[PDB]
Design a protein around this ligand. Sequence first.
Ligand SMILES: CC[C@H]1OC(=O)[C@H](C)[C@@H](O[C@H]2C[C@@](C)(OC)[C@@H](O)[C@H](C)O2)[C@H](C)[C@@H](O[C@@H]2O[C@H](C)C[C@H](N(C)C)[C@H]2O)[C@](C)(O)C[C@@H](C)C(=O)[C@H](C)[C@@H](O)[C@]1(C)O
Ligand SMILES: [Mg+2]
Ligand SMILES: [Mg+2]
Ligand SMILES: [Mg+2]
Ligand SMILES: [Mg+2]
Ligand SMILES: [Mg+2]
Ligand SMILES: [Mg+2]
Ligand SMILES: [Mg+2]
Ligand SMILES: [Mg+2]
Ligand SMILES: [Mg+2]
Ligand SMILES: [Mg+2]
Ligand SMILES: [Mg+2]
Ligand SMILES: [Mg+2]
Ligand SMILES: [Mg+2]
Ligand SMILES: [Mg+2]
Ligand SMILES: [Mg+2]
Ligand SMILES: [Mg+2]
Ligand SMILES: [Mg+2]
Ligand SMILES: [Mg+2]
Ligand SMILES: [Mg+2]
Ligand SMILES: [Mg+2]
Ligand SMILES: [Mg+2]
Ligand SMILES: [Mg+2]
Ligand SMILES: [Mg+2]
Lengths: 113, 108, 134, 205, 56
Amino acid sequence: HGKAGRKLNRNSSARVALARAQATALLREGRIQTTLTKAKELRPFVEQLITTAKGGDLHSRRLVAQDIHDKDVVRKVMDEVAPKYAERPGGYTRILRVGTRRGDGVTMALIEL
Amino acid sequence: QTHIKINRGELLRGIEQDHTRQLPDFRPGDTVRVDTKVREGNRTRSQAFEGVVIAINGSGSRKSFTVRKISFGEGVERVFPFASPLVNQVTIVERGKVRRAKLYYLRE
Amino acid sequence: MIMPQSRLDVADNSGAREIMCIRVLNSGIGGKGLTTGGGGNKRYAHVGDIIVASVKDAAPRGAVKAGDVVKAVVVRTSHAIKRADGSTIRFDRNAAVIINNQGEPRGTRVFGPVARELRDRRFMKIVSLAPEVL
Amino acid sequence: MKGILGTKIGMTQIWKNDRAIPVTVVLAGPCPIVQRKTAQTDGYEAVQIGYAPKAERKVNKPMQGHFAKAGVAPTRILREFRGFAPDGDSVNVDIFAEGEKIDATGTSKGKGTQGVMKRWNFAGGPASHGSKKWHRRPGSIGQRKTPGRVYKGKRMAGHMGMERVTVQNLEVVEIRAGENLILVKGAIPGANGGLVVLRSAAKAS
Amino acid sequence: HPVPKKKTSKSKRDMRRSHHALTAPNLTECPQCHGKKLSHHICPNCGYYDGRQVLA
RNA sequence: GAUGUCGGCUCGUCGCAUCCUGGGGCUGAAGAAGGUCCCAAGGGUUGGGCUGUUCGCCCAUUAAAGCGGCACGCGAGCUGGGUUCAGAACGUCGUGAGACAGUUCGGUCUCUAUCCGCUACGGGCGCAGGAGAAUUGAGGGGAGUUGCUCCUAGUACGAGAGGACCGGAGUGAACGGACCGCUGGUCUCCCUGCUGUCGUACCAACGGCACAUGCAGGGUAGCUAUGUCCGGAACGGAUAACCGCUGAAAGCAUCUAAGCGGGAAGCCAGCCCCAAGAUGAGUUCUCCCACUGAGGUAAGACUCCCGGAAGACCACCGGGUUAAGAGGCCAGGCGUGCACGCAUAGCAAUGUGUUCAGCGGACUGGUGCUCAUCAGUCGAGGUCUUGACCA
RNA sequence: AUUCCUUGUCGGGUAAGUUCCGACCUGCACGAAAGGCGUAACGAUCUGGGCGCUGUCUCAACGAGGGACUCGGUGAAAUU
RNA sequence: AAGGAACUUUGCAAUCUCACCCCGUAACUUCGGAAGAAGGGGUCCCCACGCUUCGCGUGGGGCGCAGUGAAUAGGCCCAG
Ligand SMILES: CC[C@H]1OC(=O)[C@H](C)[C@@H](O[C@H]2C[C@@](C)(OC)[C@@H](O)[C@H](C)O2)[C@H](C)[C@@H](O[C@@H]2O[C@H](C)C[C@H](N(C)C)[C@H]2O)[C@](C)(O)C[C@@H](C)C(=O)[C@H](C)[C@@H](O)[C@]1(C)O
Ligand SMILES: [Mg+2]
Ligand SMILES: [Mg+2]
Ligand SMILES: [Mg+2]
Ligand SMILES: [Mg+2]
Ligand SMILES: [Mg+2]
Ligand SMILES: [Mg+2]
Ligand SMILES: [Mg+2]
Ligand SMILES: [Mg+2]
Ligand SMILES: [Mg+2]
Ligand SMILES: [Mg+2]
Ligand SMILES: [Mg+2]
Ligand SMILES: [Mg+2]
Ligand SMILES: [Mg+2]
Ligand SMILES: [Mg+2]
Ligand SMILES: [Mg+2]
Ligand SMILES: [Mg+2]
Ligand SMILES: [Mg+2]
Ligand SMILES: [Mg+2]
Ligand SMILES: [Mg+2]
Ligand SMILES: [Mg+2]
Ligand SMILES: [Mg+2]
Ligand SMILES: [Mg+2]
Ligand SMILES: [Mg+2]
């Protein structure tokens, strides 16, 4: 009876480099649209990452620097984005479903900051 | 699958404690286990186990620990429930400097 | 947990170094002799269990030479052994005492620690030859 | 005859005297009596008890009526016991005593659609020598021309577990009433949060 | 190996296809741009889901 | 114009001329252990050496290591060792080509199941209103095995040596069900350690690649045996061979001819699970009500969304703002085992402090920060005949 | 690699060895360039044994990935 | 896990083994070989001294479970 916390779609290394890239982009743009499930995956991974960032010490920043590879992206999350959520009990990301797609028939959605 | 609002943490822990017992704090290092033993018949023979502690596993009534001795040329391991009524106290021989919470390499 | 084909050590001076198992049995010591084991399966030899075994490598000069087919009692299992307070014992090497059909050992003394369960199982003289009963 | 409903909470390590006993913690919470089944307006002897409290808003108009009849409360769950003739409502206080054997029944943790390996035991075949059948892959399902068919009630893959299962003669170790808690030597079936029924020993010595 | 024995008849075959009947979307008109949208998503027309979202 | 053939492996199931276990009669049956015959097919019937072998021989066991059937059951289930293709060799027969009662090494086992049959699981309709929930069981399946020891009792018996029935206690084996507290497995990125090289400018710190985890060391939840817990029964009824009561035909005798009582692991019932499509469609509790000229609607569902110890999909369970459902966040657990930076110590490698540190998948509660918004779809008015009871 | 009788008889190893090694001789039907008997080395050869090590196995378990399942797109086949 | 060939026609398959340096290495032999027989030990980092070139040896010290730290990488033997 398969029971666990994690979902994967591709392999073990992929789901990382991808969740890293999608986190990176949502923090870069502020909203992106992707397939609904991929968004559902992205939500809590990036959320925890917003919380590493707030707290503001060099340690925090170097923790962020592992998943987020663009120095500009991290500086934004750290200095701009992190602090901005302050009295926020945690968890700004929300999920909006847009609608189905042409080629693969997949329903897609926006995840926004 | 029965929906009651209840905390299993405090429920379970409810009787853990009465069956839970606190030991001298040892991460590493050697230890004398003084263990009271009735399997000799009426007789209760205190036995000594003086080992290196190789394992810390568990918590709650289930918390246990493991020592390893060599008695008479051949290796032995033993696993004591921190509260085992078959046990009187444990004391530290010395304090070890160890790098990981396991120490299984000691078998080789 | 011993099976046929499974080499055990010898806890005695009976003159046999390594023996290989042949048959686990149900080991009835009590009454007059040993009794006859209930069941022809019983797949594993625990501690305090009798096995039958071929004597595989033995030292020169002994009451027991190589090829001797003989009953033995199981002294040390690597496979863990749990007690009723809950502690567990396990030794690094597997090992045993070669005996006779009345249960008494064939060697003049016993080597290294033996499982306390052996005294549970009423093997007295073996418990008496024991450097340590753990 | 006797019985009550409760939820499985966990298994734990415990000592009574000097022996270490695995228990399973159940909570049999007070169990209201919603209907009594009698030979007259019902026709067989039973009783009906509720267990898991319900938000009054979420209850049906009809079921609200049912609970109204006896005037108890909302409950997520209703169960019938047999030859049971209680008075008031039902807690294990005075119901079970320490040391009674009990029949403790639950619903197995469902295992999905499993092999015959999990399901039926069986064997499967050599991962070693030339085999294209490993793992489950049973051999024949039958003989050849007589009856060319396969036996009704054969054993093959399927939804495994999720079984209603009663476990016979479990020993009641400790009882804390008013904490509505009960300890039972050994395993009760089904996962935690699970609904279980503790009842009198069916047959024993 | 294992092929089918005869052709299947038109009758039994369409009997098989008994179940492939399509479920048409259960729609609802959007409270904002007054065009029919789909439950728990955005109205593709205005972009409004509780106030306003996508730009169309 | 093809019914694949030895042996094995996998899965069984059936007969009884019964290997064990159960009940009996007789005995050249003292007891113990037997020999034979009758009843009995519930269950059980071990692991190895040689051989392609079934068979058979031997090792160590055992309650016992039963015999056959099912196309010498089973290749659209597996093997392909044995024989019946092509190569090659030996003995051998043939002038030869070649050959065989031989032996020897080698030698392709075919993609995607239509129907029936089978294990699972939904959809529709039926069950004289529309619904929510609790149920009787008609019937049906699972299960069913056994040693050992103790008491009885050193008793009955027996010159002795020995040594019980019956009844009553324990304790296992193997098998099955559940379970993960314990013992352990494994937990593909939860923690750490390591090498080469590439990168984030460099240092320091990190990331990739070295699996589809680069390697190693641990390892929570889940899952899991070898691990743990429970089981096989007691009782009752009707029987088998069998043992008897009463008693004639036949003044005697007679278990039978009227009749009546004992008697098995077997039969029924008892135990666990399924079960009203038990179209002979059952029972109990509650809810909405007596619209409209097929349609609005009540009670009540469904769609949808969020999730689950539920699951291929469907189905099932829970939550969906009169909200703690899930995520996040907080606190704790638990894993890992002492972070970064800095300071200090040393020529340095490293060491020490700060630091039971840092980090964090699945655990246990808490919190209205996020998404469960909004809405739509569907769903009763109760056929008839007789009989009873009331106006 | 010829052996029918055949699991020939003794022994070696094995707890037990119809195979294997050794010895015998009754060679069903070895034998001297269709070579006889030997030989170090060699061999993806064949046969027996041991050590080491292992999921080959008792007896299976967990983990990964790629199919198998579900939705959207394209959409065959042997057979009948 | 415990066991280790009990699997099987057969260890088929899959482990173990693995580089380079040092030491060491049998019957038999056509004196070439057998041989990489078999075994045993070293392997990383820093510091001083020396050296015949990348480097190497010596001494001392440090870290880890482990230092051909990841990839490339012989299991072996006895009889026929
Ligand atoms: C790869 C796929 C091929 O199949 C095989 O290789 C299998 C492995 C052959 O058996 C091979 C291997 C083997 C062992 O048979 C399984 C062997 O006995 C035969 C002679 O050759 C098959 C099946 C043979 O059939 C069998 O032929 C026997 C003469 C009669 C038998 N019949 C009783 C039912 C029948 O099934 C046979 C003749 O090749 C089939 C004919 C139709 C073919 O030519 C077809 C095109 C095949 O080549 C094939 C489907 O492409
Ligand atoms: Mg699960
Ligand atoms: Mg899951
Ligand atoms: Mg990779
Ligand atoms: Mg552990
Ligand atoms: Mg297997
Ligand atoms: Mg067939
Ligand atoms: Mg037929
Ligand atoms: Mg059936
Ligand atoms: Mg056949
Ligand atoms: Mg079909
Ligand atoms: Mg079991
Ligand atoms: Mg646990
Ligand atoms: Mg650097
Ligand atoms: Mg790659
Ligand atoms: Mg690992
Ligand atoms: Mg300095
Ligand atoms: Mg992380
Ligand atoms: Mg011989
Ligand atoms: Mg060549
Ligand atoms: Mg091991
Ligand atoms: Mg074998
Ligand atoms: Mg075999
Ligand atoms: Mg191989």
